[PDB]
Amino acid sequence: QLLPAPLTNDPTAIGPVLPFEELHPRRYPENTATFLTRLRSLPSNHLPQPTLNCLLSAVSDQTKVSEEHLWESLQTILPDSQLSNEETNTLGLSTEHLTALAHLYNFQATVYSDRGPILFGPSDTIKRIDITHTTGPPSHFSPGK
């Protein structure tokens, strides 16, 4: 809810800090797309692929989209500060990145977590995928049920 300084300082973005679902309206499952972000304006800087890439490999398996294309798509819609930071380098990508990918590639994911299945991504979509998540630690995403 509070405004993150790296986000407001991020020169790849413009405008005010708003929930993802306000800046990118879709039929998201409630309380999944409320995370704060800013509109991405600068073209891609071609960030290196994340070292902890299991979310990309899992979504890639289920969509047949390369991890490179998934990652470049994330750079179309999210500020760089939300893609390369202390958290992504030590914990990997998160279900918030999954929500962003779900918008960019029009799918809804069922995430089979240690707490049960949870939907991420817009309902106004045709494509469905299955992703497994274990808390660990470490966090791990895998494709399929």
Author numbering: 730 to 874
What does the report in the manuscript say about this coordinate set?
We also reported that the TYMV papain-like cysteine PRO domain involved in the proteolytic processing of the viral replication precursor protein, also displays a DUB activity that was able to rescue the viral polymerase from degradation. The structure of the recombinant TYMV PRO/DUB domain we solved previously (residues 728–879 of the TYMV replication precursor protein) highlighted its homology with members of the ovarian tumor domain-containing (OTU) superfamily of DUBs. In addition, the TYMV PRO/DUB structure displayed a surprisingly exposed and minimal catalytic site, with a Cys783-His869 catalytic dyad instead of the conserved OTU DUB Cys-His-Asp/Asn catalytic triad. The structures reported herein reveal that the loop harboring the 865-GPP-867 motif is a highly mobile flap on the otherwise rigid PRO/DUB framework a result that is confirmed by molecular dynamics simulations.
In order to get an atomic view of a conformation of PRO/DUB not constrained by the crystal-induced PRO:PRO interaction, we generated a recombinant mutant harbouring deletion of the five C-terminal residues (hereafter ΔC5), corresponding to residues 728–874 of the TYMV 206K polyprotein. The ΔC5 crystal contains two molecules per asymmetric unit, hereafter referred to as molecules 'A' and 'B'. Clear electron density is present for residues 730–874 of molecule 'A', and 732–874 of molecule 'B'. Both molecules have their C-termini far from the catalytic sites of other molecules in the crystal packing. We thus have two independent views of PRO/DUB not engaged as a substrate in a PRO:PRO complex. Superimposition of molecules 'A' and 'B' of the ΔC5 mutant with the WT (engaged) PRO/DUB shows that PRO/DUB retains the same conformation in all three environments, with the exception of loop 864–868. In molecule 'B', Pro866 at the tip of the loop moves by 9 Å to a position overhanging the catalytic cleft. In fact, in molecule 'B', the mobility of this loop leads to the closure of a hydrophobic zipper between Pro866 and Pro867 on one side, and Leu820 and Leu781 across the catalytic cleft on the other side. His869 and Cys783 also come significantly closer together. However, it is clear that, in this closed conformation, His869 is now close enough to abstract a proton from Cys783. In summary, the crystal structure of ΔC5 indicates that, while TYMV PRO/DUB is a rigid molecule, it harbours a very mobile loop, 864-TGPPS-868, that can shift the GPP flap at its tip with its atypical double cis-proline, from an "open" state where it can be recognized by another PRO molecule, to two other states: a "closed" one where it forms half of a hydrophobic zipper, and an "intermediate" one, halfway in between.
